[PDB]
Ligand binder design. Structure first.
Ligand SMILES: CCCCCCCCCCCCCCCCCC(=O)OC[C@H](COP(=O)([O-])OCC(O)COP(=O)([O-])OC[C@@H](COC(=O)CCCCCCCCCCCCCCCCC)OC(=O)CCCCCCCCCCCCCCCCC)OC(=O)CCCCCCCCCCCCCCCCC
Ligand code: BCL
Ligand code: BCL
Ligand SMILES: CC[C@H]1c2cc3[nH]c4c(c3C)C(=O)[C@H](C(=O)OC)c4c3nc(cc4[nH]c(cc(n2)[C@@H]1C)c(C(C)=O)c4C)[C@@H](C)[C@@H]3CCC(=O)OC/C=C(\C)CCC[C@H](C)CCC[C@H](C)CCCC(C)C
Ligand SMILES: CC[C@H]1c2cc3[nH]c4c(c3C)C(=O)[C@H](C(=O)OC)c4c3nc(cc4[nH]c(cc(n2)[C@@H]1C)c(C(C)=O)c4C)[C@@H](C)[C@@H]3CCC(=O)OC/C=C(\C)CCC[C@H](C)CCC[C@H](C)CCCC(C)C
Ligand SMILES: COC1=C(OC)C(=O)C(C/C=C(\C)CC/C=C(\C)CC/C=C(\C)CC/C=C(\C)CC/C=C(\C)CC/C=C(\C)CC/C=C(\C)CC/C=C(\C)CC/C=C(\C)CCC=C(C)C)=C(C)C1=O
Ligand SMILES: COC1=C(OC)C(=O)C(C/C=C(\C)CC/C=C(\C)CC/C=C(\C)CC/C=C(\C)CC/C=C(\C)CC/C=C(\C)CC/C=C(\C)CC/C=C(\C)CC/C=C(\C)CCC=C(C)C)=C(C)C1=O
Ligand SMILES: COC(C)(C)CCC/C(C)=C/C=C/C(C)=C/C=C/C(C)=C/C=C\C=C(C)\C=C\C=C(/C)CC/C=C(\C)CCC=C(C)C
Ligand SMILES: CCCCCCCCCCCC[N+](C)(C)[O-]
Ligand SMILES: CCCCCCCCCCCC[N+](C)(C)[O-]
Ligand SMILES: CCCCCCCCCCCC[N+](C)(C)[O-]
Ligand SMILES: CCCCCCCCCCCC[N+](C)(C)[O-]
Ligand SMILES: CCCCCCCCCCCC[N+](C)(C)[O-]
Ligand SMILES: CCCCCCCCCCCC[N+](C)(C)[O-]
Ligand SMILES: [Fe+3]
Lengths: 302, 281, 241
């Protein structure tokens, strides 16, 4: 047959790439890691270096404390034995405080208090990671697109476990930390609010989620189809359109009547994805604060 | 009607069927034999939905709903009023989707590009056919298919899921969701990265792919690269839909009880099955 | 109304401006639309051209402003086949030599892409210190076979993307001792040969050549890639199963 360009046929390796400097503090980059041949069939072989500033070590320290806080609780639920621990891994849960304690931080360790400690640690882990997303871009003089897209995801997370619980006056409304327990919560949330399929925001979220799969399928397939003219080299094709960009546009124009540019498609991309969590977070935020039952709401619209 | 750079590409050839008969455009649209086929199947499907709605007694698109035949018909033909229309429409839709794919193949040939797009599209086509053809046939009735209507089709999703408990517990459905979520993560980042380089801080020079790789290595310690991310997106996308089809093909066929109970295989492994304590003992 | 129907109705408005914005951003190349004779078309659609933006290109290479004046900046050897709009345009010469159809190239700049340090992105591996084949069959030394199952040449080097660490072209030596670049995406490295489906052995000399032996320009890449992709349509008569 013809080659498809899904895996590389030959790997080529040179000296490790220490990266661009620009305004980065090089004192905080690690060494280079090993080269992965396995990874090299699909993308780059080079692991590392990585950047570790104050904000990184903080994120990573808190992130680990969150994880271990949960695991201590799981080991506990498992009467401290490793067979029971593995047997019930998916069934253990760290639940939030009972409605009784509302928004108070006075609930005991065994009945809410641990959930809060863990949630505190998760809160700083994420926000600090967010700042690091911004600062890493600034150090290299790039746009803040990544920090802004990440914020969209933080929106839904913040609504789920922080804002909506505050607005309802209890921590009990937040999500528990468990594999099966957080699925139960989700299914339960829907039932209690009159079926989330009547939440219009939920339906838009779905459309952008599906839409994201559609678009990335279109976009990747397109770039692979024109990789024989150097299509993957997107920044230089922005600066200086080549036949790759031309054929990519034309395929789609001839197919469906309109097309993108090489820069433009990435705007379509970032928005399609970002709107998943943007609409989703609004859908959840309004549930129980303003609308008790989406079926009922859907019958009036008011 | 043409983009400034388009004329050089509008040459004859690349058709699979019909030679030069349908080798032309209408405005921006390539036609081809499969252009004609998709028009024919779409027109016919739309007419038939229209007819369905007169029989239903509503022109309101929020109420129109073409239902499959009742389970009592099994895999037989059914009368038009009671499921036959759904059957003919499904044929037409299948014809229109497959025709759309083959038309993309023609367009690929004329542009001398690869076939990755229609290939990817065939995954969506295959998910559709799982729900309306493969699953129903293995289950022994057209009735197990979803109806064609805006809200009725969500009804179906919901009633179908809840037949098996909370569907979250379908393990293939878990894998599929993972890929869906991950795909959206990856698309956000890809779009963000490229744009953050084309559109750097005000006053600065456009960044380079090296800045892109550096950015990610700084952030998470790895960068898959610019060929790698398009390979990735294609793969996350298609895997999502593959595992979707699979989680449904097995539901009602090999597994027809409550999905939550499936997980008892794990908990009842003899090494730990009777050890007391935990959640499950 | 209530707050939720306020939220949803607002959202739809927002979304409409977003599509507006997105669509006009994707009109910065290729527009205005033209008629087949190149004059500006009457019906441009409902969205207007966006206000121009300017990219500052790195490494002293200037600026780009889009939208801006469009122009192929090359002759196109095609003629109409019908007396009315919408039909194909037949090549008037040899479409592989003339660069039309699937053999098209664009008149990109006749400079090489540079890396973030200002060095040529792509280099023959012989001139790229530290670089080696780390995995897979090394093509260097393999005979190259065309779709007519005849030997067109032998591989004498790999040209590599240094920053992306990736093979991009095989440099192939032909019967007369000259070489050509072939894109990696259009070849098949088998264990005992490289197979090239797009071209027959007799079309390898026709591949456009590069002006310097240790670099390729963006214009040369487009000409080379356009040419070998074009053989899928135009070499076909000579391609065995
Ligand atoms: C109720 C429902 C309400 C629905 C509303 C939904 C929410 C709306 C959010 C709007 C975001 C707009 C951001 C923006 O300014 O984009 C600049 C962006 C510039 O991008 P660029 O050219 O690459 O900039 C390059 C420079 O280097 C500059 O590079 P840079 O690094 O500076 O990046 C600039 C830009 C780059 O970002 C992007 O282009 C995409 C990023 C998406 C942002 C998503 C953030 C989501 C946050 C969630 C918060 C919850 C929502 C609360 C409700 O980032 C930002 O704009 C900063 C946003 C920070 C907001 C902080 C909020 C605090 C709380 O241009 C746009 O995208 C414009 C979008 C236009 C939208 C359509 C307008 C609709 C108007 C309606 C009226 C029409 C009537 C029709 C009848
Ligand atoms: C029976 C259950 C209900 C239901 C209940 C809910 C509920 C409840 C919710 C959704 C939500 C969503 N549902 Mg619904 N849903 C149902 C039926 C469906 C169906 C379907 C029938 O086919 C589909 C396709 C969907 C699809 C969706 C998505 C569009 C949306 C989630 C977006 C997202 O990306 O979240 C995933 C993304 C996030 C959670 C953001 C996470 C970001 C943070 C910052 C990540 C931190 C990582 C952490 C630090 C760990 C580190 C890891 C290590 C470093 C590796 N639902 C049924 C009807 N659904 C959500 C929504 O938006 O509703 C409007 C939601 O809250
Ligand atoms: C209450 C219901 C149950 C449930 C029951 C079900 C059921 C039942 C199903 C799913 C399916 C899925 N669910 Mg579940 N699901 C639930 C909760 C969730 C949650 C969540 C957040 O809780 C999520 C994220 C999901 C996620 C998903 C996806 C994995 C999958 C749907 C995508 C898909 O198959 O696309 C595949 C895409 C297609 C079929 C689209 C095909 C497009 C065709 C080819 C072309 C269309 C052309 C068209 C006519 C266009 C005309 C255009 C105009 C002319 C322009 N479910 C709850 C617990 N879920 C479905 C699945 O896996 O299906 C295979 C499924 O059947
Ligand atoms: C458009 C919305 C989509 C989206 C977007 C999105 N997510 C993002 C971003 C964006 C734009 C980022 O920039 C950010 C990122 O950095 O990505 C690489 C991120 C991110 N999305 C993440 C996850 C994530 N996103 C999700 C969802 C989505 N994100 C949506 C689908 C989900 C889902 C679907 O639920 C998840 C689970 C994170 C990978 C990353 C944010 C990282 C973060 O906040 O980390 C804080 C915590 C830690 C750093 C430590 C965690 C501890 C772990 C349990 C172990 C980790 C390894 C270990 C610490 C290393 C070894 C230790 C020692 C030996 C050194
Ligand atoms: C493989 C993974 C993802 C994917 C990929 C994908 N889709 C694609 C492609 C690719 C690569 C294309 O090339 C192709 C395209 O042209 O995109 C613009 C396409 C496409 N994906 C589309 C839709 C679509 N894709 C979806 C999903 C996905 N597509 C996946 C998530 C969905 C979902 C998630 O539901 C939808 C709705 C179309 C925009 C387009 C194909 C257009 C097409 O086939 O046109 C010919 C058919 C008609 C013009 C209409 C015929 C009408 C019927 C005869 C009657 C209607 C019957 C129907 C059953 C009614 C249902 C009613 C509903 C209310 C339930
Ligand atoms: C970088 O490269 C790339 C490009 O460009 C450089 C691109 O453009 C694209 C394509 C992407 C975009 C333009 C962005 C927007 C796309 C989406 C958000 C996906 C969703 C698309 C739609 C909703 C449009 C659907 C419309 C369709 C399928 C066509 C509608 C058709 C008709 C009304 C006519 C029907 C045609 C028929 C019947 C056959 C032919 C006509 C006859 C008359 C016969 C990608 C992926 C890309 O990666
Ligand atoms: C300018 O660009 C860009 C770059 O470059 C400079 C970049 O570096 C990056 C940076 C990118 C990264 C750091 C990578 C991002 C990674 C993630 C978001 C998470 C990674 C997720 C996983 C590792 C899970 C994947 C699991 C897999 C693949 C399991 C295996 C699955 C299968 C084998 C599927 C089988 C089923 C099917 C149907 C096969 C499909 C058909 C074919 C393969 C044919 C970005 C964003 C970018 O934008
Ligand atoms: C092998 O054994 C070891 C001991 C080594 C470790 C094993 C650990 C292990 C297997 C852990 C398992 C962890 C799992 C499965 C966790 C599951 C997590 C899930 C599913 C989380 C899902 C959603 C969480 C949400 C939405 C939480 C949002 C939290 C927010 C928004 C923060 C809210 C903040 C507060 C309440 C703090 C309030 C106080 C202040 C000052 C802000
Ligand atoms: C999504 C979170 C990404 C986490 C990446 C984890 C990498 C751990 C850093 C180890 C480096 C230690 N060091 C610098 C001494 O080599
Ligand atoms: C999600 C990405 C996977 C994490 C990769 C982390 C790579 C860190 C490499 C740095 C190791 C440095 N060290 C100790 C070998 O010198
Ligand atoms: C940036 C991408 C824009 C594409 C938007 C697609 C709109 C989907 C319409 C879904 C209908 C939602 N509704 C009304 C039922 O809630
Ligand atoms: C879901 C919304 C409707 C489908 C998308 C509209 C397709 C637009 C392509 C036709 C217009 C192209 N044009 C103006 C050259 O004719
Ligand atoms: C409030 C207006 C809603 C308009 C929705 C779009 C109407 C298009 C025709 C819908 C056809 C419905 N059908 C046949 C799938 O059942
Ligand atoms: C429903 C998804 C988004 C629909 C967006 C429709 C945009 C149509 C753009 C048509 C413009 C074509 N034209 C005339 C400029 O060539
Ligand atoms: Fe891209």
């Amino acid at each position: 047959a013809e080659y498809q360009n899904i895996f590389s046929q030959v790997q080529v390796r040179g000296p490790a790439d220490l990266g661009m400097t620009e305004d980065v503090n090089l004192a905080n980059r690690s060494g280079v890691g090993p080269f992965s041949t396995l990874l090299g069939w699909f993308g780059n072989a080079q692991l590392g270096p990585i950047y570790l500033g104050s904000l990184g070590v903080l994120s990573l320290f808190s992130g680990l404390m969150w994880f271990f806080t949960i695991g201590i609780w799981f080991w506990y639920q498992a009467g401290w034995n490793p067979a029971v621990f593995l047997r019930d891994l998916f069934f253990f849960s760290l639940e939030p405080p009972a409605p009784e304690y509302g928004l108070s931080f006075a609930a005991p360790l065994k009945e809410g208090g641990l959930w809060l400690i863990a949630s505190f640690f998760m809160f700083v882990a994420v926000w600090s990671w967010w700042g690091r997303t911004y600062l890493r871009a600034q150090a290299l003089g790039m746009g803040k697109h990544t920090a802004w897209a990440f914020l969209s995801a933080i929106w839904l997370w913040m609504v789920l476990g922080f804002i909506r619980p505050i607005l309802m006056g209890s921590w009990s409304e937040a999500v528990p930390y468990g594999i099966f327990s957080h699925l139960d919560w989700t299914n339960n949330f829907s039932l209690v609010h009159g079926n989330l399929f009547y939440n219009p925001f939920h339906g838009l979220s779905i459309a952008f989620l599906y839409g994201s799969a559609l678009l990335f399928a279109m976009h990747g397939a397109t770039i692979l189809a024109v990789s024989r003219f150097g299509g993957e080299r997107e920044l230089e094709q922005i600066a200086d359109r080549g036949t790759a960009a031309e054929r990519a546009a034309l395929f789609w124009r001839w197919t469906m009547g309109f097309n993108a540019t090489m820069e433009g498609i990435h705007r379509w991309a970032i928005w399609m994805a970002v709107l998943v969590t943007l609409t989703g977070g609004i859908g959840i935020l309004l549930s129980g604060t303003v609308v008790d039952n989406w079926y009922v709401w859907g019958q009036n619209h008011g | 009607a043409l983009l400034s750079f388009e004329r050089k590409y509008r040459v004859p050839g690349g058709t699979l069927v019909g030679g030069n008969l349908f080798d032309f455009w209408v405005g921006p649209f390539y036609v081809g034999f499969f252009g004609v086929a998709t028009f024919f199947f779409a027109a016919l499907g739309i007419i038939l939905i229209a007819w369905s709605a007169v029989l239903q007694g509503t022109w309101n698109p929020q109420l129109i709903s073409v239902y499959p035949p009742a389970l009592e018909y099994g895999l037989g033909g059914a009368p038009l009023a009671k499921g036959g229309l759904w059957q003919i429409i499904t044929i037409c839709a299948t014809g229109a989707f497959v025709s759309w794919a083959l038309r993309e193949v023609e367009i690929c040939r004329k542009l001398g590009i690869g076939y990755h797009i229609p290939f990817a599209f065939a995954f969506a086509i295959l998910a559709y056919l799982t729900l309306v053809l493969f699953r129903p046939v293995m289950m022994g009735a057209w009735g197990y298919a979803f109806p064609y209507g805006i809200w009725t089709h969500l009804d179906w999703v919901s009633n179908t899921g809840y037949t098996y408990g909370n569907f979250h517990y379908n393990p293939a459905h878990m894998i599929a969701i993972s890929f869906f979520f991950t795909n959206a993560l990856a698309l956000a980042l890809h779009g963000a990265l490229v744009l953050s380089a084309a559109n750097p801080e005000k006053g600065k020079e456009m960044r380079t792919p090296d800045h892109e790789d550096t950015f990610f290595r700084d952030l998470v310690g790895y960068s898959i690269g610019t060929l790698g991310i398009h390979r990735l997106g294609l793969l996350l996308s298609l895997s999502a839909v593959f595992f979707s089809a699979l989680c449904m093909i097995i539901t009602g066929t090999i597994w027809f009880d409550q999905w939550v109970d499936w997980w008892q295989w794990w908990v009842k492994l003899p090494w730990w099955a009777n050890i007391p304590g935990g959640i499950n003992g | 109304f209530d707050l939720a129907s306020l939220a949803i109705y607002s959202f739809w408005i927002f979304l409409a401006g977003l599509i507006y914005y997105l669509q006009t951003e994707n009109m910065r190349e290729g527009y205005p639309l033209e008629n087949e004779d190149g004059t500006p078309a009457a019906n441009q659609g409902p969205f207007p051209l966006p206000k121009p933006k300017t990219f500052i290109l790195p490494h002293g290479r200037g600026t780009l402003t889009v939208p801006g004046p469009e122009s192929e900046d090359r002759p196109i050897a095609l003629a109409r086949t019908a007396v009315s709009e919408g039909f194909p345009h037949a090549p008037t010469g040899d479409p592989m030599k003339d660069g039309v159809g699937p053999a098209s190239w664009v008149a990109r700049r006749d400079l090489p892409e540079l890396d973030g340090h200002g060095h040529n992105k792509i280099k023959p591996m012989k001139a790229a210190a530290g670089f080696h084949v780390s995995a897979g069959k090394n093509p260097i030394g393999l005979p190259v076979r065309g779709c007519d199952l005849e030997i067109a040449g032998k591989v004498v080097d790999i040209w590599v993307d240094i920053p992306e660490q990736m093979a991009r072209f095989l440099e192939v030596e032909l019967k007369d001792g000259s070489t050509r670049l072939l894109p990696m995406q259009m070849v098949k490295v088998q264990s005992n040969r490289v197979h090239v489906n797009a071209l027959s052995s007799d079309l390898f000399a026709g591949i456009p050549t590069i002006k310097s032996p240790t670099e390729v320009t963006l214009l040369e890449e487009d000409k080379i890639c356009g040419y070998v992709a074009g053989g899928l349509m135009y070499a076909a008569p000579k391609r065995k199963s």
